[PDB]
Amino acid sequence: GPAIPIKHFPKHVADLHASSGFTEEFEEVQSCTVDLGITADSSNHPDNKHKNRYINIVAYDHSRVKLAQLAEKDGKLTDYINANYVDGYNRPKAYIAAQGPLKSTAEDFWRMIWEHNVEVIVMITNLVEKGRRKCDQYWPADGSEEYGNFLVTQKSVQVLAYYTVRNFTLRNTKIRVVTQYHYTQWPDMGVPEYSLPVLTFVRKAAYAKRHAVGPVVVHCSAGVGRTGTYIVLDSMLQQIQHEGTVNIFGFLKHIRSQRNYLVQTEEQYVFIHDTLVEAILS
Ligand SMILES: CCOc1ccc(C(F)(F)F)cc1CSc1ccsc1C(=O)NS(=O)(=O)c1ccccc1
């Protein structure tokens, strides 16, 4: 879809509301991928059967984040984690989009952080919301934890009201800093919406990874809806800033080819537009 100059984008959005066109646009975004050369064999192999939080959320073979293989006595495949490399604005493979780890893949998660040279992590969920398990806690409550070969240490936590920042050290104990930005304002009643600190959150995250040679981890629960919502906002604040145009429709359609369901629902989709409208007005 077309590259909307900032100036025109407010009316562009107002239209689609008044128009009501958001629904159709999103149906096109959904049917655009239509499995085209796209497989998920690793995700469905029996060794990996327990590594998938949701059974219908899969990591497509071509973009999936490969782990190094290790030979265990059990013989089972060790190359697998439910996450995919996802492009950014002038930047192939800027993001890793990942499901939130399980108790049983927290070591795999860290080892991914390790092997793919990650320094920053973006967490867009609580462990629990409306009394449903979303994500299992994969960093140490207090001080240090070993996750197999991987030693993680909590060196500080800046708890703000809309979000928390946790700086660890990551070590491989068979012979680095990782900063986690974890948004925490998840309403118990209603659905998400409000701009200022969401943008701030994204702005401070965009800053902290602005120099990071590696990709950044984005993870929610399944690692598709919110994770996607963020990937887009992030990239579009970039493109906005480097060309003063904004291409949500075309950029999302692009990344749906790299991970299933990125930006999961219409509300998120809209959310993105409304939020960006606001971001500008300054
Ligand atoms: C209130 C705090 O909300 C946010 C904070 C930070 C971000 C960020 F990081 F910029 F992406 C985005 C959001 C927006 S998430 C959103 C927006 C409209 S519906 C929705 C959402 O997550 N509905 S869900 O939890 O029902 C859901 C969740 C996942 C899949 C399907 C559905």
Residue numbers in the entry: 1696 to 1722, 1730 to 1877, 1889 to 1995
List sentences from the manuscript.
PTPRZ and PTPRG, which structurally resemble one another, are members of the R5 receptor-type tyrosine phosphatase (RPTP) subfamily. The membrane proximal phosphatase domain (D1) is active, but the distal D2 domain is inactive. Three isoforms are generated by alternative splicing from a single PTPRZ gene: two transmembrane isoforms, PTPRZ-A and PTPRZ-B, and one secretory isoform, PTPRZ-S (also known as phosphacan); all are preferentially expressed in the central nervous system (CNS) as chondroitin sulfate (CS) proteoglycans. PTPRZ (the human ortholog is referred to as PTPRZ1) is strongly expressed in malignant gliomas.
We have newly identified NAZ2329, 3-{[2-ethoxy-5-(trifluoromethyl)benzyl]thio-N-(phenylsulfonyl)thiophene-2-carboxamide, as a cell-permeable inhibitor from other hits found in our previous screening. NAZ2329 showed a more potent inhibition of the first PTP domain (PTPRZ1-D1 fragment) (IC50 of 1.1 µM) than the whole intracellular (D1 + D2) fragment (IC50 of 7.5 µM), indicating that the inhibitory effect of this compound is caused by its binding to the active D1 domain. NAZ2329 was trapped by a newly identified cleft just under the catalytic WPD loop. The catalytic WPD loop with NAZ2329 (left) showed an extraordinarily open conformation compared with that of the apo structure (middle). NAZ2329 formed two hydrogen bonds with the catalytically essential Arg-1939 in the conserved PTP loop10, which may prevent the bidentate interaction between the arginine side chain and phosphate group of the substrate, thereby inhibiting enzymatic hydrolysis. We then focused our attention on Val-1911, which lies at the bottom of the newly identified cleft. It was conserved in PTPRG, but considerable diversity was found in the other PTPs. Indeed, the V1911F substitution markedly reduced the sensitivity to NAZ2329. All these results support an allosteric inhibition mechanism by NAZ2329.
